[PDB]
Amino acid sequence: IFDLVVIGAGSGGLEAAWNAATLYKKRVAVIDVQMVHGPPFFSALGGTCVNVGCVPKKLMVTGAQYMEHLRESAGFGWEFDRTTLRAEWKKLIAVKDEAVLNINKSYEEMFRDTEGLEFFLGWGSLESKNVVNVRESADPASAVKERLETENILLASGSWPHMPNIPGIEHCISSNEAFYLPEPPRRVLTVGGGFISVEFAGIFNAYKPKDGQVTLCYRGEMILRGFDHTLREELTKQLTANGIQILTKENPAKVELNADGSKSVTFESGKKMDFDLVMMAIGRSPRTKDLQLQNAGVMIKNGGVQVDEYSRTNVSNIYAIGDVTNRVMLTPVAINEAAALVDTVFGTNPRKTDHTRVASAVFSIPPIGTCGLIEEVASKRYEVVAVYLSSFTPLMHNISGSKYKTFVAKIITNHSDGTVLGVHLLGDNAPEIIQGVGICLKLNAKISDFYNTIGVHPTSAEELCSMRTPSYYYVKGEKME
C-alpha cells in the first residue's frame, strides 16, 4: 500500500514522485508504459521532454544550426572545399539516441537507489478512488499485472500528438516517429502552424539532400498562431529566405500513397502535391485516453482532467499536473505544478503555480524568445498601451551574408503606469536573452527601469535597455498618438 501512485514517469510526474519520497519521506509508486525511449510507445522513463521532446529536438536543432555556421563562416575568412561539405543525418540521430538513453539509464538508478520510489512497468488504469492497476496493455481487458492500493493518486499521463481524420492519415507520421527516421526525407510536408511544425521544418531543411525541399503548410493566414504579429511575419520571411516553402491557407484533405512509396497529398484547397514524408503536427491532446477516469469519477473539462489552482480533481484524493491538465504545456511549468502539489498535500503551506508571465522559446532558425502579453490582448485589457519596436540587421550579419536575418525586439507596455506587459524577440540567442526578462516581468519591471539599465556592449540583448520612446499606441484602437 502506497501514499502516492503517480501515473506517468514524466517531467511533472517524476518531480512530484521524488519530492514526496525524498523530502517528505513518503512511499511512492511510479508507473510508466516502457523504460527506454523509442518505438512502440516512444515515451518512456523521463516522459515526453526527454525521449521525444525537448532534449532530443534541441540536439537536433543545434545540429541543424551548424549549417548556418558553416555558411556564414566564410565571410569572416574561413575557407574550405564547400563542395566537399555534407550533412550526416545518421550520425545525428545516432548520438541523440545515446544521449536520450542515458537520461533513461540514470532514472533507473534513481529508483534503484532511493527508498519509497519504485517503478512499475505497464499501463496505469484507475480501478477506484484508490486502487490503480498496472495492467499489461492499453486495453483494459489485457492482463492485470499489479493492483496498487494507495491513499493518493497523481495523474501525470501527459499528452499525445493529435492526428486529423483524413483519407490516408495512415501514411503520415508525427513528432514521435520523426525522431527515429532511418534517413532524412527529400520532400517533406510538415502539416501544422507553429512550434513543433516550424521547429522540425528547420531540422529537416538542414539535413535534406540538396535537391530536397521542405514545405511547411498551415491552414492559417500566418504560421505560429498566437505569437506577436511582427515575430510571425519576420520568421515567415526568414524561413522562406532559407528556402522552406510556407503554404498558408492550405490543408490536407487526403493523403494517398502513390506507387514508388511517394505520397500524393491533395489539399482541400484544390492543390495536389507529391511528398516523400508527411508529418502531422496539427496538435497535442491530453492522454486522458486510457486512464479509466470514470472508474474513480474524475472529470474532464475539455480534452483533459479538470483541476483547480491547487491542481486537484473532483475526487478528493486524486490530483493532476502537466499536460493532462491542458494548462500550459511546457516542461518547467509541469515541474512547478508537480513541486507545489506535494508541498501542498504532503507539506505545511499550500502552493500554487503562477501560470502567468511564463517565458518561452521557439527553436526555429532563427529562434524566438517571448514573455508576457501580445499586443492584441493587452489592448483589450488596458486602456492605453504603448508598443516599443526595434528591428535591425546586425552588423555581423551584413558581413556574414545573411542580411535577411533581422533582429526584432518588441516591448509592449501598460502606458498608464509603465509596467512592461510583454517582451518579444526574434533572432539568434533569443531564448537565452528572454530568461532574464522573465525574472524582470515577475518583479513588475517598468519600461523606465529597462531603459535605465546600462547596456552590455556589444550584445543584441542591450537593445532592450535602449528603447525609451514608444512607436505607436493602442487607445482602444491602434493609434500612432
Residue numbers annotated as active site? 457
Helix (H, G, I), strand (E, B) or coil at 446: strand
Q: Per rule CB under 8 A, is residue 403 in the interface with a second copy? A: no
In the complex, least distance from residue 81 CB atom to a second copy, rounded to whole angstroms = 4
Q: According to the binding rule CB under 8 A, does residue 440 interact with a second copy?
A: yes
Cα–Cα distance, 354 to 362 (Å, whole number): 21
Per rule CB under 8 A, is residue 87 in the interface with a second copy?
yes
Quick one: 140 or 209, whose CB is closer to ligand FAD? 140
User: Which phi-psi region, left, alpha or beta, contains residue 350 (left: φ > 0; alpha: ψ -120 to 50)?
Assistant: beta
Please select the residue that binds a second copy; options are 262, 459, 476, 479, rule is CB under 8 A.
Answer: 459
Q: How far is the CB of 180 from a second copy (least distance, A)?
A: 15
| Residue 2 marked as a ligand binder | no
- What is the DSSP track for 304-357? EE---TT-B-SSTTEEE-TTTTTS---HHHHHHHHHHHHHHHTSSS------SS
CA 252 to chain CA mean position, Å: 23
- Shortest approach of a second copy to residue 376 CB, angstroms? 23
Which residues bind to ligand FAD, rule: CB under 6 A? 7-13, 31-33, 41, 43, 47-49, 53-54, 57, 123-124, 156-158, 175, 196, 287, 290-291, 322-323, 329-332, 334, 457
Contact partner, 31, from ligand FAD, a second copy, none, Cβ < 5-8 Å per class: ligand FAD
Which window, 213-221, 258-266, 342-350, 390-398, contacts a second copy (CB under 8 A)?
390-398
Q: Does 332 bind a second copy (CB under 8 A)?
A: yes
Residue 190 near residue 281, CB atoms below 8 Å: yes
Q: How far is the CB of 157 from ligand FAD (least distance, A)?
A: 4
The answer to whether 5 is annotated as binding is: no
> Which secondary structure element, helix H or strand E, spans residue 216, and what is its range?
strand 213-218
Cell of 82: 564547400
Q: 284 CB contacts (<8 Å, ≥6 apart)? A: 159, 160, 161, 162, 323, 329
Binding partner selected for residue 84 from a second copy, ligand FAD, none, CB under the kind-specific 5 to 8 Å limit: a second copy
Query: Amino acid identity of 104?
Result: N
44 in a labelled binding site: yes
Cis peptide leading into 161, omega within 30 of 0? no
Angle at 203 (CA atoms; ends 202, 206), nearest 5 degrees? 90
* 261 assigned ligand-binding residue: no
Q: How far is CA 457 from the centre of its chain?
A: 32
CA-to-CA dists, residue 212 to 184, 193, 414, angstroms? 9, 21, 47
Residue 352 binds a second copy, judged by CB under 8 A: no
* Nearest approach, Cβ of residue 323 and ligand FAD (Å): 4
As beta bridge partners, residue 422 has: 372, 412
Tell me: does residue 347 bind a second copy (CB under 8 A). no
- Residues 279-298 vs a second copy: string with x where CB under 8 A? --------------------
Query: Does the footprint of a second copy cover residue 341 (CB under 8 A)?
Result: no
CA atoms of 142 and 101, how far apart (whole Å):
28
Choose the one of a second copy, ligand FAD, none that binds residue 92, judging by a C-beta under 5 to 8 angstroms depending on kind: a second copy
| CA pair distance 133, 378, nearest whole angstrom | 47
| Nearer CB in complex with ligand FAD: 7/273 | 7
Total residues interacting with a second copy, rule: CB under 8 A: 78
158 binds, among a second copy, ligand FAD, none (CB under 5 to 8 A by kind): ligand FAD
CB of 391 to ligand FAD, least distance (A): 23
Residues 211-240 that bind a second copy (CB under 8 A): none
Which residues sit in the known binding site for FAD?
32-48
